[PDB]
Amino acid sequence: ISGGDAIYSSTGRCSLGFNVRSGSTYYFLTAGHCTDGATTWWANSARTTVLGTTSGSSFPNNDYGIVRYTNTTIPKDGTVGGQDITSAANATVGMAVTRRGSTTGTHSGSVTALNATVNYGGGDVVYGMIRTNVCAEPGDSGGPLYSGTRAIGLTSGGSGNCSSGGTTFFQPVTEALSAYGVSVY
Amino acid sequence: VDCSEYPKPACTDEYRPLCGSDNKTYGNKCNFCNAVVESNGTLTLSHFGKC
Ligand SMILES: [K+]
């Protein structure tokens, strides 16, 4: 299971962000809005394959959550699709980035702005977000945003779609890595 | 679903579909309600789940 693949909770579907780990403990990052209120996470709609359970969730204000792997057999590739990821890095205006999500597949684009404020309503505001011209649709939430072999962020939301084009805001993954004391592998 | 608070400038991309009257599956409530607005009140909910 890698970056971009589907993940299911009791509530609905999201996309796995990146495989991370501390010491000998494996987890995976994803969106906080998806980790909010979830406990268990399965690898399939059928909920037959358990992946693990929620370990932290920060949403709103930020938009990242972490899941502890409890599945022993599942392979945990440190990839995005079969794209090797070897480092984390700060987004920059003009950077070329690629996103991968369980509903849309891979789409690329550029970072158009930093520190963006996203107001999803009813007090769910998130701050310090990366803005891009990359599209995303329902189910792609939490998927990885990368550049070459660099992890850059996690899909949070935006507007538009992939047919007509849109805007998508991501949570800097460095932030999440630090808060949890984990790292990409 | 109540769409009065809409429209909203943005929507999170989580999936929990709704079936609109245009026979299209909306990937999520926020998406669905923004379409209801954009249709100027003409789009309705057929049922929860995919179409
Ligand atoms: K979208």
Side-chain angles (χ1 to χ4, degrees), chain A residues 11-13 120 137-141 156-158, chain B residues 8-16 27-28 31:
Chain A
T11 54
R13 174 169 48 101
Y120 304 112
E137 309 183 3
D140 296 327
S141 249
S156 171
Chain B
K8 289 159 164 78
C11 295
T12 48
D13 278 303
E14 90 278 11
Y15 187 68
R16 299 175 90 209
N28 76 42
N31 276 267

Side-chain angles (χ1 to χ4, degrees), chain A residues 90-185:
Chain A
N90 279 322
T92 59
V93 189
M95 173 178 285
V97 304
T98 301
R99 179 197 58 58
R100 183 188 200 253
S102 80
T103 287
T104 53
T106 295
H107 289 275
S108 310
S110 307
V111 168
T112 65
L114 304 179
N115 243 244
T117 294
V118 183
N119 169 57
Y120 304 112
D124 296 322
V125 182
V126 314
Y127 302 98
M129 294 310 265
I130 303 181
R131 162 166 191 167
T132 70
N133 53 353
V134 173
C135 66
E137 309 183 3
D140 296 327
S141 249
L145 183 90
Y146 66 105
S147 183
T149 52
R150 310 169 290 188
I152 305 300
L154 307 161
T155 307
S156 171
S159 58
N161 51 82
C162 295
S163 198
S164 301
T167 289
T168 312
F169 296 105
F170 297 81
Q171 150 85 63
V173 67
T174 54
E175 271 269 69
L177 289 192
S178 212
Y180 301 129
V182 299
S183 42
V184 300
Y185 71 89

Side-chain angles (χ1 to χ4, degrees), chain A residues 9-95:
Chain A
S9 75
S10 64
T11 54
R13 174 169 48 101
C14 288
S15 290
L16 185 156
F18 301 96
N19 287 323
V20 315
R21 103 260 197 108
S22 177
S24 35
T25 301
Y26 292 94
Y27 305 81
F28 72 70
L29 309 153
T30 169
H33 64 272
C34 298
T35 49
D36 201 61
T39 59
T40 292
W41 290 98
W42 296 268
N44 66 326
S45 48
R47 269 76 173 185
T48 80
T49 315
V50 169
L51 282 166
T53 43
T54 319
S55 313
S57 175
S58 188
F59 180 97
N61 324 295
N62 296 300
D63 201 358
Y64 61 72
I66 181 161
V67 178
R68 183 163 18 99
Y69 270 101
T70 59
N71 190 126
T72 38
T73 41
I74 210 97
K76 322 169 175 58
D77 307 312
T79 64
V80 183
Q83 174 59 48
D84 194 68
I85 285 313
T86 73
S87 100
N90 279 322
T92 59
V93 189
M95 173 178 285

